[PDB]
Write a protein that binds this ligand. Structure first.
Ligand code: BEF
Ligand code: BEF
Ligand code: BEF
Ligand code: BEF
Ligand SMILES: [Mn+2]
Ligand SMILES: [Mn+2]
Ligand SMILES: [Mn+2]
Ligand SMILES: [Mn+2]
Ligand SMILES: [Mn+2]
Ligand SMILES: [Mn+2]
Lengths: 128, 128
């Protein structure tokens, strides 16, 4: 994918955002911003420019499933890639996320290799 | 749901197809056919008339994940309900099926109540 692709990294814990930002850097993507919840994330997205969202699920103010659904229903950003990265691993919840339009799903804790594979699967599926 | 709804039950072992067939009858669905692999299944699905697929994962010729992907990518049956019923219980398998478009996912062994619950969950989601 284009290395200038602008990522939004969403999680309510700095440590988790830090992990994903560093990994993205390793993969050659330095155009990365952070958000600490779904509202913060929507505020940044509507400022424009973003080409990929990586999001946690359990967060205050607006959780990640709501964020995903909000993105998917919004005609301005309905096709924005959204990769869920979350400790949530219950079968019904994994299905709920896919059905809400998740581009991919990663369970914490995850390895660098897993994140890289998940991103590339999405890049390819979407021809990026 | 409509008791005439036609089901296709896909598994490479007769015993499991037999379990599902009998459960569906108990629930009032007698319009039920069987297939022994993904290819057998697609042959029947393309004969037309099916309203619901219940499918195993591990099968020769074409496995259930390939079967699901094929169904979902096909213009003529892309929204066909597909309930996975499989011994594959790893989260990475569940994710792969969910992301591929599974309507639901039940892990073997399963009780009659679980199958009924998950079928009804799919009926409600699709307004059937
Ligand atoms: F972490 Be961001 F700046 F809200
Ligand atoms: F808080 Be997340 F869902 F891991
Ligand atoms: F088992 Be089926 F009839 F192919
Ligand atoms: F063989 Be199946 F996936 F249970
Ligand atoms: Mn913190
Ligand atoms: Mn969280
Ligand atoms: Mn479930
Ligand atoms: Mn047999
Ligand atoms: Mn038909
Ligand atoms: Mn099998």
């Amino acid at each position: 994918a284009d290395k200038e692709l602008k990522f939004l990294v969403v999680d309510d814990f700095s440590t988790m955002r830090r992990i994903v930002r560093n990994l993205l850097k390793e993969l050659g993507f330095n155009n990365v911003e952070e958000a600490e919840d779904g509202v913060d994330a929507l505020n940044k997205l509507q400022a424009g420019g973003y080409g990929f969202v990586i999001s946690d699920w359990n967060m205050p103010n607006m959780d990640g499933l709501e964020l995903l659904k909000t993105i998917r229903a919004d005609g301005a950003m309905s096709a924005l890639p959204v990769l869920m990265v979350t400790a949530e691993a219950k079968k019904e919840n994994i299905i709920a996320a896919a059905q809400a339009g998740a581009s991919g799903y990663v369970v914490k804790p995850f390895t660098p290799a897993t994140l890289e594979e998940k991103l590339n699967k999405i890049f390819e599926k979407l021809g990026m």
